[PDB]
Amino acid sequence: GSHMIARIIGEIGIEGARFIEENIDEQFKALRYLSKGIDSETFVKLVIANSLVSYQLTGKGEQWWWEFAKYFYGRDVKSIYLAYKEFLPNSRFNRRLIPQKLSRIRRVETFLSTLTEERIEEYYGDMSSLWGSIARALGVDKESKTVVFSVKMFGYAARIVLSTFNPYPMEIPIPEDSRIVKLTKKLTNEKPRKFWMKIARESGVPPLHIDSILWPLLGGASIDSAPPELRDKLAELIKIIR
Ligand SMILES: [Cl-]
Ligand code: NA
Ligand code: NA
């Protein structure tokens, strides 16, 4: 029932997506932790690099992002490529496809070097521009696996270092990972990005914010940390998605 889903998503709204992002989502929690142990510019660069290698993991996303945050806390990172050349083969949760993953980091090194504090601010105010800068640095389609995710994670990191919140653009689609694809197959025969773009347009909640609502809940995150009115909306959503 796409209409019912859009209604509940719209009731949750940007404010509800933001509450979930900032209080429930373990990937955000991992980022906030890392931000206390490394400088803001290096933090953002690392988040983008990490996102672009966050596929075909040897663990769940929550475990992987916590491993990343703990690994880099307090480290003196002089080259992001060399840091990942050391990190990935010693990691618990990202041991596979290392050559391909390192080649992606190599391709974005020059782009990452442009991320001064001001450039980060500018990209947070125009995430559609960031999306293309990342995709073109890699030389891949804007919609290929991890690219949209890297914009999502940038938005978490930028919120943390800039202390301000800019909603994601409506035009950036959801990430099509296992959790979202599996949920979507239970709801519809439509392809996930098309189904969720319709719900985004009907609700006015951008797809990346819908993803932020859904992804932690699909991982079994509790909703009892939400304030009462939001908790009731999330309970309604859980009936649909779990
Ligand atoms: Cl492009
Ligand atoms: Na920081
Ligand atoms: Na993605």
UniProtKB/Swiss-Prot annotation:
Reactions catalysed according to its record: 2'-deoxyribonucleotide-(2'-deoxyribose 5'-phosphate)-2'-deoxyribonucleotide-DNA = a 3'-end 2'-deoxyribonucleotide-(2,3-dehydro-2,3-deoxyribose 5'-phosphate)-DNA + a 5'-end 5'-phospho-2'-deoxyribonucleoside-DNA + H(+)
SUPFAM superfamilies: DNA-glycosylase (SSF48150)
Organism, as annotated: Pyrococcus abyssi (strain GE5 / Orsay)
Name assigned to this protein: N-glycosylase/DNA lyase
Origin: domain of life: Archaea
Residue numbers binding 8-oxoguanine: Q27, S54, W65, F149, P175, D211, W215
Domain notes: Contains two alpha-helical subdomains, with the 8-oxoguanine binding site located in a cleft at their interface. Contains a helix-hairpin-helix (HhH) structural motif and a Gly/Pro-rich sequence followed by a conserved Asp (HhH-GPD motif).
Keyword terms: DNA damage, DNA excision, DNA repair, Hydrolase, Lyase
Disulfide bonds: none
Task of the protein: DNA repair enzyme that is part of the base excision repair (BER) pathway; protects from oxidative damage by removing the major product of DNA oxidation, 8-oxoguanine (GO), from single- and double-stranded DNA substrates.
Active-site residues annotated for this sequence: K145 (schiff-base intermediate with dna), D177
Family from the record: Belongs to the archaeal N-glycosylase/DNA lyase (AGOG) family.
Parts of the chain that traverse the membrane: none
Gene3D superfamilies assigned: Hypothetical protein, domain 2 (1.10.340.30)
GO molecular function annotations of the record: class I DNA-(apurinic or apyrimidinic site) endonuclease activity; oxidized base lesion DNA N-glycosylase activity
